[PDB]
Amino acid sequence: MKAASVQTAATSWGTVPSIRVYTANNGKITERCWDGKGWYTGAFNEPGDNVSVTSWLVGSAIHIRVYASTGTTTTEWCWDGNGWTKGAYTATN
Amino acid sequence: ASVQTAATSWGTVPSIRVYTANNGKITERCWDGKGWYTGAFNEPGDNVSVTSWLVGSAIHIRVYASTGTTTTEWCWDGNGWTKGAYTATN
Amino acid sequence: MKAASVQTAATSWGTVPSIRVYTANNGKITERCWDGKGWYTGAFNEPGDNVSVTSWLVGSAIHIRVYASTGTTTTEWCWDGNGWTKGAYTATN
Ligand SMILES: O=S(=O)(O)c1cc2c(O)c(c1)Cc1cc(S(=O)(=O)O)cc(c1O)Cc1cc(S(=O)(=O)O)cc(c1O)Cc1cc(S(=O)(=O)O)cc(c1O)C2
Ligand SMILES: O=S(=O)(O)c1cc2c(O)c(c1)Cc1cc(S(=O)(=O)O)cc(c1O)Cc1cc(S(=O)(=O)O)cc(c1O)Cc1cc(S(=O)(=O)O)cc(c1O)C2
Ligand SMILES: OC[C@@]1(O)OC[C@@H](O)[C@@H](O)[C@@H]1O
Ligand SMILES: OC[C@@]1(O)OC[C@@H](O)[C@@H](O)[C@@H]1O
Ligand SMILES: OC[C@@]1(O)OC[C@@H](O)[C@@H](O)[C@@H]1O
Ligand SMILES: OC[C@@]1(O)OC[C@@H](O)[C@@H](O)[C@@H]1O
Ligand SMILES: OC[C@@]1(O)OC[C@@H](O)[C@@H](O)[C@@H]1O
Ligand SMILES: OC[C@@]1(O)OC[C@@H](O)[C@@H](O)[C@@H]1O
């Protein structure tokens, strides 16, 4: 397809800080990461036309949730330290 | 091309709120650590963003619902959703 | 064509609180601000069809990152206490 304009979502944590920026582009969401020393590409790569994100700390451990939507189906993807796993989020859109 | 979403979270449980704009209406799904359920937020909007903050242990949520060039702010402050003072000149 | 629905992004900090709302409208992003005493127009004004935002505190100092996208080009804008400056962010494409 052709990407008219991409759509991003962003989250951050700590004081360095760490930042994650998710970009929905041509039905694919990819991730860019900053941990204080340059931007690099993250492991998140899942389908989606629209993305939102939230994150929180448990102690010094980061937890990230990415809500990826295509059509009326939103899939939650979870980062809890050991790879991206599909979460329990469901909606009836 | 799809529904549009916005998400916020608070605490360490955590609580999460996910807002979805679909065909002109924004609805809300909630996580408080024990399963997803539908929340009380239901207002018009084609586009949505959200932010939230804690005062002590109390949560305050602001949802920015946009239709055309008009953005309406909706406020949760512990007892129902009320319209906020936000305006813009778009 | 009639102007399509605007797209917004929001961040907040502290307990007053301070809130910043960014609106992408007809290719331009503007900013509205709240710090407890009425909404007002902020200094941020840059091109973009899409906007996302994140912010974090270092002590009392707020740091804001706005991701403004036009086409497939995302520009990061940085607030670190004294004016907006362009950040190092580049995307995968
Ligand atoms: O159905 S698709 O999404 O695959 C599609 C592919 C192409 C298309 O040309 C179009 C759709 C139609 C079309 C849409 C738009 S938009 O909806 O406003 O984005 C714009 C154009 C257009 O032909 C005009 C146009 C603009 C530009 S740009 O100003 O540089 O972004 C480039 C092109 C355009 O045709 C060339 C072009 C690039 C691309 S690329 O995949 O982005 O390289 C695909 C297609 C192209 O015609 C080939
Ligand atoms: O096609 S739409 O469903 O978006 C539509 C909604 C409304 C409409 O009145 C029209 C279309 C017709 C219309 C078309 C055009 S044109 O296509 O650009 O020539 C222009 C107008 C118009 O009413 C005039 C107009 C423009 C604008 S602005 O471009 O955003 O400044 C706003 C309005 C206009 O009447 C007010 C308005 C707002 C809204 S909103 O969605 O609540 O913001 C809906 C409708 C409105 O008429 C109600
Ligand atoms: O250190 C990089 C990384 O592991 O950080 C956590 C998540 O953002 C992952 O997708 C990403 O690859
Ligand atoms: O650990 C994963 C999980 O339980 O985290 C909290 C929520 O995001 C849930 O939807 C998700 O499945
Ligand atoms: O526990 C559910 C609830 O009361 O939480 C706070 C707000 O998100 C409300 O819309 C929602 O119904
Ligand atoms: O208590 C509601 C309110 O004052 O909260 C702070 C801002 O969100 C204002 O727009 C809003 O009217
Ligand atoms: O007090 C307003 C202001 O300085 O707050 C920080 C940034 O949001 C600036 O763009 C904005 O003008
Ligand atoms: O001080 C600016 C900067 O270094 O802050 C951290 C990241 O946002 C970088 O992209 C950015 O250039």
Numbering used by the authors:
A (entry chain A), C (entry chain C): -2 to 90
B (entry chain B): 1 to 90
Publication passage describing the model:
Using the trimeric β-propeller Ralstonia solanacearum lectin (RSL) as a scaffold, we generated a series of mutants with extended and dynamic N-termini. RSL is a C3-symmetric homotrimer with a six-bladed β-propeller fold and two sugar binding sites per monomer. The three N-termini are located in close proximity at the narrow end, and are typically disordered in crystal structures. Specifically, we show that the rigid, bowl-shaped sulfonato-calixarene (sclx4) captures cationic N-terminal motifs, resulting in ordered structures.
The MKAA-RSL – sclx4 asymmetric unit is similar to that of MK-RSL – sclx4, with one protein trimer and two calixarenes binding two of the N-termini. In the MKA-RSL – sclx4 and MKAA-RSL – sclx4 structures, Lys1 is encapsulated by the calixarene in the known binding mode, involving at least one salt-bridge and one cation−π bond. While Lys1 is encapsulated, Met0 is disordered. Elongating the N-terminus results in greater steric accessibility of the lysine, which is now favored over Met0 for sclx4 binding. In the MKAA-RSL – sclx4 structure, the two calixarenes bind at similar sites but in different orientations. This suggests “fluxionality” of the sclx4 – protein exo-interaction, i.e. the calixarene can slot into the groove in one-way or another. The MKAA-RSL spectrum also has a weak signal for Lys1. At 1 eq sclx4, the original weak signal is unperturbed and a new high intensity signal appears downfield. No further changes occurred at 2 eq sclx4. This system was in slow exchange, suggesting micromolar affinity, and likely corresponds to lysine capture, as observed in the crystal structure.
